[PDB]
Design a protein around this nucleic acid. Structure first.
Length: 190
DNA sequence: GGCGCGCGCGCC
DNA sequence: GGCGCGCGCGCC
């Protein structure tokens, strides 16, 4: 609701997303917790640099994240706020699968995930991902992709959502998700 | 009392 | 940030 002073923890450079808005994603934190912010505005990037303190007014707050529009006001401010170490650590860490299983649809998920299997289709790709807590599926709609991922590689997800599909709970790409394939290193020939 | 879960922290 | 480990609380 009212203006909120937050400390910026992470922010990617803007990329073109879908109408056809240029946007970016950031992670910010108060003294108690962190949340991810989708900033529609793009102009706002110069204010979203890690460790800077910003005051944000006129924003939307949904079930999981915070939306910052061109109607919003982002003002750089000097603050004595300090983010506790573990709030930063949790803000930045990749959630476990067993933890993800019990989150509402629309919950924003970012992180780095080991993939065991890739079910390919010209309209979607399903990535079997795994950790020690379970297995899960990551649904990326509409690509070959150009990011060809083999087993043993990793996928870096930005702004995916927990999703229900009938029986199973997966991770779903949205229109403004970012997806990247992180390839396992090739042993070389001296 | 046992144990799982969330959380914190230290080592890599 | 990943990973492993201990602590405390709440449910059984």
């Amino acid at each position: 609701m009212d203006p909120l002073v937050v400390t910026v923890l992470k922010a990617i450079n803007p990329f073109e997303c879908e109408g056809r808005q240029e946007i970016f994603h950031a992670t910010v934190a108060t003294e108690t917790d962190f949340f991810f912010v989708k900033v529609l505005n793009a102009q706002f990037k110069d204010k979203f640099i890690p460790k800077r303190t910003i005051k944000i007014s006129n924003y939307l707050w949904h079930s999981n994240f915070m939306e910052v529009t061109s109607s919003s006001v982002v003002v750089d401010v000097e603050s004595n706020h300090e983010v506790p170490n573990n709030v930063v650590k949790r803000a930045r860490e990749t959630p476990r699968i067993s933890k993800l299983k019990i989150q509402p649809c629309g919950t924003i998920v970012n992180g780095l995930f080991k993939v065991q299997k890739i079910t390919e289709e010209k309209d979607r790709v399903l990535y079997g991902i795994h950790d020690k807590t379970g297995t899960m599926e990551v649904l990326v709609l509409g690509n070959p992709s150009k990011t060809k991922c083999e087993e043993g590689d990793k996928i870096r997800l930005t702004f995916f959502e927990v999703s229900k599909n009938g029986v199973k709970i997966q991770l779903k790409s949205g229109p403004c998700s970012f997806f990247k394939v992180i390839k396992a290193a090739k042993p070389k020939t001296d």
